[PDB]
Amino acid sequence: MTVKKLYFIPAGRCMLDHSSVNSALTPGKLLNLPVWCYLLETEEGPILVDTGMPESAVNNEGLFNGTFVEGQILPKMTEEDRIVNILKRVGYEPDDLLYIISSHLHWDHAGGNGAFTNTPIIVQRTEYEAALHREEYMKECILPHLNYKIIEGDYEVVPGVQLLYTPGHSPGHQSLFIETEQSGSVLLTIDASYTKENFEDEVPFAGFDPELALSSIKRLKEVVKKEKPIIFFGHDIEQEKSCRVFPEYI
Ligand SMILES: [Zn+2]
Numbered sequence: 001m002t003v004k005k006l007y008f009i010p011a012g013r014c015m016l017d018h019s020s021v022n023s024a025l026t027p028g029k030l031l032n033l034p035v036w037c038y039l040l041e042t043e044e045g046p047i048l049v050d051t052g053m054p055e056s057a058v059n060n061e062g063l064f065n066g067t068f069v070e071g072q073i074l075p076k077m078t079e080e081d082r083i084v085n086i087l088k089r090v091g092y093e094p095d096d097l098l099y100i101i102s103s104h105l106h107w108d109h110a111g112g113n114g115a116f117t118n119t120p121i122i123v124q125r126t127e128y129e130a131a132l133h134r135e136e137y138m139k140e141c142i143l144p145h146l147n148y149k150i151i152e153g154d155y156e157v158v159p160g161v162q163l164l165y166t167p168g169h170s171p172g173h174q175s176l177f178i179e180t181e182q183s184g185s186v187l188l189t190i191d192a193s194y195t196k197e198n199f200e201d202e203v204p205f206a207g208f209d210p211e212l213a214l215s216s217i218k219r220l221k222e223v224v225k226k227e228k229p230i231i232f233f234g235h236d237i238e239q240e241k242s243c244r245v246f247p248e249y250i
């Protein structure tokens with residue numbers, strides 16, 4: 001009826017311009033932001049939420065040189081941050097997992113998806129379809145022959161694990177509402193808000209459709225008023241300071 005453990009697992013980092021967390025801002029200063037994956041230990045088995053950055057980012061800050069985001073995005077990833085290595089340390093191999101949940105298919109959330117060729121990968125149909133053609137999607141993030149479990153809208157993965165459709169930051173972005181044994185209700189916004197102020201204060205941030213992102217935030221706020229969860233944001237360096245991370249769980 002509840003998830004036994006929820007682990008916050010650091011998966012490397014990334015430098016972005018600060019206008020990414022506040023659209024109104026003028027570019028110049030850099031921000032070293034956390035990249036996260038999460039692992040859920042459940043009665044039915046372990047579930048991994050997101051898979052970190054692509055192998056091409058390892059020891060390669062200059063990954064995006066040449067492209068349309070040169071200098072605006074610098075991955076900070078070492079060999080330890082490869083998702084397979086992360087799992088090996090938590091104590092699993094890819095084929096051990098019950099499901100992978102892709103919040104969305106941006107490079108910092110699905111770069112490791114290719115490592116999982118048997119596990120069903122739960123992703124929104126609108127995200128998948130967008131990844132097939134929009135330019136912000138890397139080939140590592142859409143590989144054609146993985147075992148996708150394509151869903152549309154809200155969805156219960158296993159008891160205590162609910163996906164909430166929250167498009168806007170990307171066309172098919174989804175957040176998680178989790179009931180854990182130790183903490184009760186937890187809302188993982190993922191990138192439906194990078195920071196606490198994108199959420200509470202509705203400050204605009206990096207995204208595909210800000211009108212949609214705002215209505216997804218208002219939808220999450222209705223949920224919060226009802227369930228009163230503890231809430232964790234997608235890329236928030238102030239909140240990161242106090243987050244209990246692996247090997248602690250919540
Ligand atoms: Zn994203």
Ligand SMILES: [Zn+2]
Binds near residue numbers: 106108109191234235
């Ligand atoms: Zn992200």
